[PDB]
Amino acid sequence: LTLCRCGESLQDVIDRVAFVIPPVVAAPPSLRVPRPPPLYSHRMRILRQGLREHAAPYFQQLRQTTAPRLLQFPELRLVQFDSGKLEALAILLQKLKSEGRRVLILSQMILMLDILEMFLNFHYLTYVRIDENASSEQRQELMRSFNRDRRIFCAILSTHSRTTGINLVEADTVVFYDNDLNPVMDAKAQEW
Amino acid sequence: RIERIGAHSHIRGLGLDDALEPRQASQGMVGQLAARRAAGVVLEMIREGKIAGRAVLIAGQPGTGKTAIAMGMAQALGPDTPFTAIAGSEIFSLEMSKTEALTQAFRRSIGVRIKEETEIIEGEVVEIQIDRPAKVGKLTLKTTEMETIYDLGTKMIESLTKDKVQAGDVITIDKATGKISKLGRSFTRARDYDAMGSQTKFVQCPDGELQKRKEVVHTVSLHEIDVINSRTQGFLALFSGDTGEIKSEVREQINAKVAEWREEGKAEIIPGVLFIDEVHMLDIESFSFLNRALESDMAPVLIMATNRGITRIRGTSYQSPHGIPIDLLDRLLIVSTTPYSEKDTKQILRIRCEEEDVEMSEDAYTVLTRIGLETSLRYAIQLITAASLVCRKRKGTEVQVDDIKRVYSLFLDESRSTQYMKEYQDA
Amino acid sequence: TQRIASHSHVKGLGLDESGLAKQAASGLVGQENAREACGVIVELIKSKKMAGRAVLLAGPPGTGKTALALAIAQELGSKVPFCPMVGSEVYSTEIKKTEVLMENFRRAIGLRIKETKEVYEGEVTELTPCETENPMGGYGKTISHVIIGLKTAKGTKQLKLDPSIFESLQKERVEAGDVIYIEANSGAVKRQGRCDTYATEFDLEAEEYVPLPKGDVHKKKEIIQDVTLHDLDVANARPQGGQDILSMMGQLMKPKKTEITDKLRGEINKVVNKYIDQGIAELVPGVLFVDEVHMLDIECFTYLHRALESSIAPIVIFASNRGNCVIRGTEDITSPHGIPLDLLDRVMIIRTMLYTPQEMKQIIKIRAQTEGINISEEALNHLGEIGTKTTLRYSVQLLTPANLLAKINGKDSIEKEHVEEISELFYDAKSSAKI
Amino acid sequence: TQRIASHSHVKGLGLDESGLAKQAASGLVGQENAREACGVIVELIKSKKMAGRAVLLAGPPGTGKTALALAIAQELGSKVPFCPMVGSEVYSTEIKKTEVLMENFRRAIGLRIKETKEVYEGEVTELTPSHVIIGLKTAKGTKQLKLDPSIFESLQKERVEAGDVIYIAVKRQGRCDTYATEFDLEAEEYVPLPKGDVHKKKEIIQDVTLHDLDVANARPQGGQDILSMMGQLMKPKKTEITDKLRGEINKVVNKYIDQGIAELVPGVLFVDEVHMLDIECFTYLHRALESSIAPIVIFASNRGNCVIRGTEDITSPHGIPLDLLDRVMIIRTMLYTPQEMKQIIKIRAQTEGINISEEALNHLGEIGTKTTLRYSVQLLTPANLLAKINGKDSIEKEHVEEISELFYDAKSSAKI
Amino acid sequence: QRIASHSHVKGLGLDESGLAKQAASGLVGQENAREACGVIVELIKSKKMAGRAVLLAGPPGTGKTALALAIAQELGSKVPFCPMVGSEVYSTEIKKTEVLMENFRRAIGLRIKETKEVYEGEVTELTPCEISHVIIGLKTAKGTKQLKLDPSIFESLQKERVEAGDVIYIEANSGAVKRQGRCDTYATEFDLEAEEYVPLPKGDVHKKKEIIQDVTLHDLDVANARPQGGQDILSMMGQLMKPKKTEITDKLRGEINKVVNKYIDQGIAELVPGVLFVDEVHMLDIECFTYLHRALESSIAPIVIFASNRGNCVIRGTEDITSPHGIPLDLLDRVMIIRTMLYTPQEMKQIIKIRAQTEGINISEEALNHLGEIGTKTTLRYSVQLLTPANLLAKINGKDSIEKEHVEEISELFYDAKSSAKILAD
Ligand SMILES: Nc1ncnc2c1ncn2[C@@H]1O[C@H](COP(=O)(O)OP(=O)(O)O)[C@@H](O)[C@H]1O
Numbered sequence A: 001l002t003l004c005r006c007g008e009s010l011q012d013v014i015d016r017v018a019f020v021i022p023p024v025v026a027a028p029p030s031l032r033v034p035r036p037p038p039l040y041s042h043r044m045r046i047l048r049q050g051l052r053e054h055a056a057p058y059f060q061q062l063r064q065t066t067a068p069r070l071l072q073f074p075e076l077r078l079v080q081f082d083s084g085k086l087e088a089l090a091i092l093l094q095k096l097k098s099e100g101r102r103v104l105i106l107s108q109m110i111l112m113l114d115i116l117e118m119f120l121n122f123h124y125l126t127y128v129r130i131d132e133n134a135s136s137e138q139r140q141e142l143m144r145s146f147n148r149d150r151r152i153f154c155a156i157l158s159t160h161s162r163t164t165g166i167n168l169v170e171a172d173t174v175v176f177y178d179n180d181l182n183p184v185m186d187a188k189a190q191e192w
Numbered sequence B: 001r002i003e004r005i006g007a008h009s010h011i012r013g014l015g016l017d018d019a020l021e022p023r024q025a026s027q028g029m030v031g032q033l034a035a036r037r038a039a040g041v042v043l044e045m046i047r048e049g050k051i052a053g054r055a056v057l058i059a060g061q062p063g064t065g066k067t068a069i070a071m072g073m074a075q076a077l078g079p080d081t082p083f084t085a086i087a088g089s090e091i092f093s094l095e096m097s098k099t100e101a102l103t104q105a106f107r108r109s110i111g112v113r114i115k116e117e118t119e120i121i122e123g124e125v126v127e128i129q130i131d132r133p134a135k136v137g138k139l140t141l142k143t144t145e146m147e148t149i150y151d152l153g154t155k156m157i158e159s160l161t162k163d164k165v166q167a168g169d170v171i172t173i174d175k176a177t178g179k180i181s182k183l184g185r186s187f188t189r190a191r192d193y194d195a196m197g198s199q200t201k202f203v204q205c206p207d208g209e210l211q212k213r214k215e216v217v218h219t220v221s222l223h224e225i226d227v228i229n230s231r232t233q234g235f236l237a238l239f240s241g242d243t244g245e246i247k248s249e250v251r252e253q254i255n256a257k258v259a260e261w262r263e264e265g266k267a268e269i270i271p272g273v274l275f276i277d278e279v280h281m282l283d284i285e286s287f288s289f290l291n292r293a294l295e296s297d298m299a300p301v302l303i304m305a306t307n308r309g310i311t312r313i314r315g316t317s318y319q320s321p322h323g324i325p326i327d328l329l330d331r332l333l334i335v336s337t338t339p340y341s342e343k344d345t346k347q348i349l350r351i352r353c354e355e356e357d358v359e360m361s362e363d364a365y366t367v368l369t370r371i372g373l374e375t376s377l378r379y380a381i382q383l384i385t386a387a388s389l390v391c392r393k394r395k396g397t398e399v400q401v402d403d404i405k406r407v408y409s410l411f412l413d414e415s416r417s418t419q420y421m422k423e424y425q426d427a
Numbered sequence C: 001t002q003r004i005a006s007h008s009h010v011k012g013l014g015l016d017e018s019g020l021a022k023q024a025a026s027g028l029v030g031q032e033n034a035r036e037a038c039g040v041i042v043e044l045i046k047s048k049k050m051a052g053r054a055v056l057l058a059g060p061p062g063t064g065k066t067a068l069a070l071a072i073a074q075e076l077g078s079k080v081p082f083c084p085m086v087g088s089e090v091y092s093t094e095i096k097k098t099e100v101l102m103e104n105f106r107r108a109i110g111l112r113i114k115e116t117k118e119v120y121e122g123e124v125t126e127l128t129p130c131e132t133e134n135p136m137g138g139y140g141k142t143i144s145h146v147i148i149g150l151k152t153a154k155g156t157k158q159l160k161l162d163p164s165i166f167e168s169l170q171k172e173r174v175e176a177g178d179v180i181y182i183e184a185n186s187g188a189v190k191r192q193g194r195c196d197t198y199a200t201e202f203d204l205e206a207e208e209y210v211p212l213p214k215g216d217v218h219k220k221k222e223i224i225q226d227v228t229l230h231d232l233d234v235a236n237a238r239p240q241g242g243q244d245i246l247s248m249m250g251q252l253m254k255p256k257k258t259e260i261t262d263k264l265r266g267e268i269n270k271v272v273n274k275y276i277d278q279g280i281a282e283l284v285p286g287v288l289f290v291d292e293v294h295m296l297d298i299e300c301f302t303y304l305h306r307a308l309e310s311s312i313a314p315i316v317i318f319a320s321n322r323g324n325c326v327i328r329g330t331e332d333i334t335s336p337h338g339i340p341l342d343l344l345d346r347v348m349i350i351r352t353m354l355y356t357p358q359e360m361k362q363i364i365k366i367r368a369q370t371e372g373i374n375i376s377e378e379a380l381n382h383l384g385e386i387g388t389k390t391t392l393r394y395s396v397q398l399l400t401p402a403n404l405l406a407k408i409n410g411k412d413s414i415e416k417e418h419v420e421e422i423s424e425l426f427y428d429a430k431s432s433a434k435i
Numbered sequence D: 001t002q003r004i005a006s007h008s009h010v011k012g013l014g015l016d017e018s019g020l021a022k023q024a025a026s027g028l029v030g031q032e033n034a035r036e037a038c039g040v041i042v043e044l045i046k047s048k049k050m051a052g053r054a055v056l057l058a059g060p061p062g063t064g065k066t067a068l069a070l071a072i073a074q075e076l077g078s079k080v081p082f083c084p085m086v087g088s089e090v091y092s093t094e095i096k097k098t099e100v101l102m103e104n105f106r107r108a109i110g111l112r113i114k115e116t117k118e119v120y121e122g123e124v125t126e127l128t129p130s131h132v133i134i135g136l137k138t139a140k141g142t143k144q145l146k147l148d149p150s151i152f153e154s155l156q157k158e159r160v161e162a163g164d165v166i167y168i169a170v171k172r173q174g175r176c177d178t179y180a181t182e183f184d185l186e187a188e189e190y191v192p193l194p195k196g197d198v199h200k201k202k203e204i205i206q207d208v209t210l211h212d213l214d215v216a217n218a219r220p221q222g223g224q225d226i227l228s229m230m231g232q233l234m235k236p237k238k239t240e241i242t243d244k245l246r247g248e249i250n251k252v253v254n255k256y257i258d259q260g261i262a263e264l265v266p267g268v269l270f271v272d273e274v275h276m277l278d279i280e281c282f283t284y285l286h287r288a289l290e291s292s293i294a295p296i297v298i299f300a301s302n303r304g305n306c307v308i309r310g311t312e313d314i315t316s317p318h319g320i321p322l323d324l325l326d327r328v329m330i331i332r333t334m335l336y337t338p339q340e341m342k343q344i345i346k347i348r349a350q351t352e353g354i355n356i357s358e359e360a361l362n363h364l365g366e367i368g369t370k371t372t373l374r375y376s377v378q379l380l381t382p383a384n385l386l387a388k389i390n391g392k393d394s395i396e397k398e399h400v401e402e403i404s405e406l407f408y409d410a411k412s413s414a415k416i
Numbered sequence E: 001q002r003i004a005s006h007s008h009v010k011g012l013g014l015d016e017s018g019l020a021k022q023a024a025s026g027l028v029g030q031e032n033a034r035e036a037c038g039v040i041v042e043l044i045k046s047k048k049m050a051g052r053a054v055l056l057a058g059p060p061g062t063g064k065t066a067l068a069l070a071i072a073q074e075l076g077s078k079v080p081f082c083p084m085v086g087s088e089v090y091s092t093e094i095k096k097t098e099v100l101m102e103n104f105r106r107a108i109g110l111r112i113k114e115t116k117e118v119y120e121g122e123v124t125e126l127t128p129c130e131i132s133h134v135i136i137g138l139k140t141a142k143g144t145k146q147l148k149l150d151p152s153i154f155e156s157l158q159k160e161r162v163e164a165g166d167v168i169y170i171e172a173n174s175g176a177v178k179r180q181g182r183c184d185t186y187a188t189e190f191d192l193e194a195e196e197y198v199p200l201p202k203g204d205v206h207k208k209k210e211i212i213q214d215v216t217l218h219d220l221d222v223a224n225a226r227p228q229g230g231q232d233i234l235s236m237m238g239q240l241m242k243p244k245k246t247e248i249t250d251k252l253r254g255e256i257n258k259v260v261n262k263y264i265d266q267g268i269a270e271l272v273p274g275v276l277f278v279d280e281v282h283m284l285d286i287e288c289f290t291y292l293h294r295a296l297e298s299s300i301a302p303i304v305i306f307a308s309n310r311g312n313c314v315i316r317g318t319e320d321i322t323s324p325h326g327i328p329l330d331l332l333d334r335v336m337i338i339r340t341m342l343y344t345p346q347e348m349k350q351i352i353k354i355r356a357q358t359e360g361i362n363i364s365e366e367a368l369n370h371l372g373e374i375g376t377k378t379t380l381r382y383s384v385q386l387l388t389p390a391n392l393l394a395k396i397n398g399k400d401s402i403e404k405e406h407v408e409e410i411s412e413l414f415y416d417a418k419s420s421a422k423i424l425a426d
């Protein structure tokens, strides 16, 4: 029969085991290895025969080998929870998608662009990022791919490039995530 | 639905008022206003959970309702809060030390409600056209207010092939992992196949096409340590008691990550209760451990019951009240249960009869209350059952005096057993 | 092989329709009040309304406590389970005492689980009637239905099954002429094997040819399986299916009987209730006869008088033979019947008086009858007299040896001389005490 | 909020610049000589020069020896490990008792090691194979790594579009590449392309204890040979041998130290309830304390002259034999006075979040000096709940009176 | 040689007529116990009786263990002799009765007579034909030939990584192993391969010799207590409990006895019952004595020698029953008791001189007298222990032999049980 393995009402056991895995081994080393400068042929042959015998039943595969955990990466939730700006952005994007309007996210730091990328991936919102690294023609190609493609929801810009290549707008919704208050940057930014 | 009424089934909560004022008879309890008010206030403290490591000792003569008030508190606490009931002799395991069993029992009555944001797409599969090469596929989900077609990927197509999903099936696909979860069907299957007959489930939510922030609160106890001690944990979480895991890197690390989750809003701690019935059976080492284990922040509320006065502590020679060392006994506060009077006994017997669905005359109630005040209460309930059975056999409607008096001679009490025991059967 | 046991004459409490007691009570004689109490408690059990109730069969040795216990057990019938246990069995070196007690309690509880499955079988004649391509799309070649010509011993019946099953058909070697095991709802095909009609004597192969099915193609097989709650506990305890469990060294130690309360209670109880209220199973609480209860440690009684408090605990029939004795595991703590005074308050004591010499004679005679050996009046009187002198169980043991002595001496019936000679060849402990 | 504990009110010894024990500070109150001795002990610990020393905080019940040791731990800091232990913890059914105490001594010691880990991250562009020439692509550039066969992945780990992060000794399939536009609905979830360079070395200053390395080298779980997986397949256990305990471990730790790779961090081991240990534990502690590698141990005994467990024949002071009781310094804590009792009650009420009136505080102090201080401490919360139910924000004398009437102390229950 | 406590005991010291000499073969005095030992040793050599028991009872330091070692030496290594101690029975993974039965089985030995022959051959000549028939070449330092083998041997051979120019041993009945190199691997100048090479073997290509392997029934039991390896059942890892909990007697030990009897009737095996010397018998529990007085009654039990140092006392596990020699009257009876008497001062001095001669220490006349006096004062063992440091100090001081000064100084330096107890009253 099927059991819950815990106090929760109903949930997939796989999800149960995957949710709660805080601890990783403190300091697991490799196995010990005797080092006799001479290695007698008898013992080495016996060990090779044993290894061959143990490798023969490979049809099991040990079900992924159940290898230990040694990384414990941080949860993706923390990207949003770490900043209220990202929670407000999540609420705004959910509202806009319920309304069907695309969104144009404007940020100043490329690291903030990567943060926004991870955030949208946490929210599964398809996006197209246009930054300074991409050449003018590459920026125009990215903008063309964003345009006429209703499957792309968000567009992320750096606000530091010229951005004179953009031609058409999709939903007429912009979100100024960051404010610079710089002499020339903000002016031309808001202008275009 | 088929679960027989036990010895403590008559009680179904701790009768209390808005101001915590105890009542004469309510929720299956009778009399004992002091201990019942103590139970109510300790239950309020439990449901508060602001303080940790509090202990209460329920003392009194046998038959005073210690286990009764314990089960009443357990019931009044209700679900969503763990209540680990255990006997003093259960900590003695041949695969785990006493201290380890006590740690397991303490961490077992502590819960963490883990919040998880989910994004599930649901609807009616109008078209599941899949092009198998032996790669391409499209799913047409339909709702009561909108429709949408989704181009399926190779892995998604394979997953759909795993869990057979025919047209008209109500499914809830998780956009995070793509797990196929079928809930039912919206209509029959062509009315022509001479097989596969079932019932039709209601239509899906109108906005079920894409649920954005479906919040599911996964509740799990701090016994999750079993998930880490070994690569294969189900064996330990289900049957295997040989869980002598390493205390370091497991207890401390799990507690640290639980604190991190509480600080980051992922989960919230809900301390439960640990009820050790007949705690006097614990060895002095177990009491010494409870002395220190009761000081941790994750310590649940430790309710204990003792049916003795001055008695020797197990594992030593010297005696202490309630069989508990002076240290732990002084740490906790004791709730004494006063014996029940004749009226309370009669009312408890009547409540039990109502629970057993048995009826008896007034003279029967009187004589049975007399017998119970003389011998005991539990013996009075045994006589209730025996007389009800004798009446059923006699084809009567209610139990009269002639049935209780008959079963009184048919079944003997320990007081009369020891009287007839003068035949020196053995020693 | 009849293999007559020690005391098999007992067949039931033998109570009259009114519930009173009689002499010829289906093998067991005497013990009127005790047999009436046994009838009351067996009526209770049959009612299946109360749980966690215990009864104590206190009485001096030789009163036939185990006899009346087996009598009430037989009266209950093989329908409800009856798990006999002795206090010594609780002492286990691999599993704690309280968990053994809980496992025994679970065993005492029964559960009948029904299972009805509509399955179709018979020799297959596969054929796909060509149908126009999907009318919603373009043209081409499709299959809207797949007809399978299941032929059974009674006749033939073609089934126009769903076309999606065609994958299963091709998966297994389902060729025209073999027996397939179809499922109504699931639809999965499980080929049983070719028909024996094609099993030519010159073809060397086994497990591949099976006889034709007898009966209609559509068969609604109704099967009932009675398994105690402990069986389900054990089944859900250990794993099955891959996971490198085939190892010998690190896995052959199957005795992991250690069990936790979370799995025992909780999920198992909930699924049992779901099967009950849904109509898939019927709960059948049995009885747990625990003889030599005085042999249990105080750590066992302290858990018993807590498990009996549970609503799921079954009926327990304790049978203590000792008198006032120190509780095991305690420091000179004398209590009646070797049981703590706290547990005796939760058990109904059924007192059993000593058998009257006439009852001794009746028991000896009925045991001789069960054994199948005739005994003369004088021999029976001498047996009764010696059973009155010493323990009664000594006399019943003098029947078979006296019977063999008589048969070897050339006579059939057991004469007084035979029992007299056996009493000198074999004697009891009371006489052996003369060291 | 964080739920209150029994000793969450103590924040430290609260001593002056010269060690003078103030009447009340840092949550503690009274026990000036004891807190000065504890200041000297924490100075010893910070010295990191002596090894194997121990102290016994023997005193009457309720004096706060446990709270005192916890305040000591807090004052020392989180860096230096502080391992709490109960006397009953030594009794185990799978590991030898003296060996339990040994592993406790070991875990009590800390070790801060520095290591540089090379991490390989990026979307897998090529997965052609023993040695596998994998191709990782990132925002910076692409590199074809000549990775070893031991890292060859068994699970899906798609040859293309799979985001993988590897470090030298296991691989983690972070997520699928950002191809969310290729399909409208796919089971796989996506993450952005890693912006960091493929090959990067980061120095992590990880803090671990010596017992971690001990138990890890005891039953390692690394490597890839099938024999390893079969060994660690089931039934982990304990009882590391002494040859592996000492010897290789100490040598490698000293190597890391003298080479600047690691830094030793001596810790503390608080063996509470030492009064109920067997004579074998004491006999092993004799040689444990007499070791140049044993850490500082703080004992907290409560019994007086009683029979030592395991012998049930001979009695000794504090339930500890004289030969051992002399090896450990004695800290004599005195009982609190009614004034100090009321002061600590007020401190706990302030920490516990309970407002108590003057008359209520006086009644609590009286009940404390009469029955027990901890009894009144326990009665604190019930009185607050009673006040809440009655609608009173602050506790009054009547509330504590009713509470005491409901709950009977141990002494009163014994009188009955 | 690392002289031990019982090295000078190289025999029992009986003459041709059977009488015990006053001092011979390292033993001194104790004529009655030596005669009993020389009688029981002949009893053992008879190989006809079974389960007969002996008890070397006597005060401490009387040489009961010395007499046991003398019996063992006189018997010779051809028969098993299991030195056993009572404390050894208290095993944690095997029950005491089972450990005792395993020791009893070890005390029985059998010699397996077998004539094995080899078919060493060259691998370079490997030329199979049909996988159904294979031929291998023979090239040794004394001859060259060729053999014809069953394809099963070819399979077992190719299983090994054979290479041209290797020396392979092929047994006529079963088995095969590889020896790499025959003065050709180092010739090509290719580096090592984690293994050592060997030149071509001398002698004829086909060799035959008589084999006699001394194996005991316990070895057979241990070998049959496992699957023997081979297929996937060969799974073997660390912590394997080779000394398994127990092994049934009727279906496992009985089969071993049956096969041994069969091979003995066939003349292939020869039984040689040994001796089981259980020292410190008083340490065994009463539940051990009760099974011991019954197991030694079986038709297969070997001769068991006992030695109880302490006299009458409470039996182990009883705490109330007291019997002489710490052995219950049940087991005490049926066991031939050999009383050992105390040594006289002259016998003590003679034993000291023999110990000095054996260990190489040289003592003077007055030194020997003083050492014997110190011995008879407290015990002979104290003098035996002081003998070594006496010569050690003598060497340190530049003296070759021991003198009165050195013995007196070393006696004052150290202390004995009597002296220690005398000063322990402080
Ligand atoms: N207040 C009460 N109301 C109803 N039944 C009670 C009460 N107190 C005791 N009993 C009955 O007395 C018997 C034993 O008393 P219990 O409730 O276990 O208290 P204790 O633990 O002191 O024995 C039980 O069968 C229980 O039903």
Ligand SMILES: Nc1ncnc2c1ncn2[C@@H]1O[C@H](COP(=O)(O)OP(=O)(O)O)[C@@H](O)[C@H]1O
Residues within 6 Å of the ligand: C006, C007, C008, C009, C027, C028, C029, C030, C031, C060, C061, C062, C063, C064, C065, C066, C067, C068, C321, C362, C363, C366, C367, C393, C396
């Ligand atoms: N009333 C009876 N009628 C016939 N035989 C009886 C009766 N009572 C006891 N016996 C006999 O007594 C023997 C054992 O009785 P048992 O149930 O073991 O009592 P106890 O367990 O107290 O010794 C049985 O073999 C049975 O034949």
Ligand SMILES: Nc1ncnc2c1ncn2[C@@H]1O[C@H](COP(=O)(O)OP(=O)(O)O)[C@@H](O)[C@H]1O
Residues within 6 Å of the ligand: D006, D007, D009, D027, D028, D029, D030, D031, D059, D060, D061, D062, D063, D064, D065, D066, D067, D068, D300, D344, D347, D348, D374, D377
């Ligand atoms: N010096 C102190 N200052 C403040 N509170 C104290 C002090 N000493 C003890 N306490 C209090 O007394 C209670 C019990 O002290 P504890 O450490 O358990 O004493 P012991 O160590 O003797 O058991 C603690 O909850 C703590 O609040």
Ligand SMILES: Nc1ncnc2c1ncn2[C@@H]1O[C@H](COP(=O)(O)OP(=O)(O)O)[C@@H](O)[C@H]1O
Residues within 6 Å of the ligand: E005, E006, E008, E026, E027, E028, E029, E030, E059, E060, E061, E062, E063, E064, E065, E066, E067, E309, E351, E354, E380
């Ligand atoms: N007959 C003897 N001749 C010479 N040396 C002896 C003789 N008997 C005993 N010894 C010596 O005395 C010592 C006594 O040792 P041991 O036999 O163990 O004494 P016990 O009689 O207590 O077993 C032995 O080391 C042995 O060398």
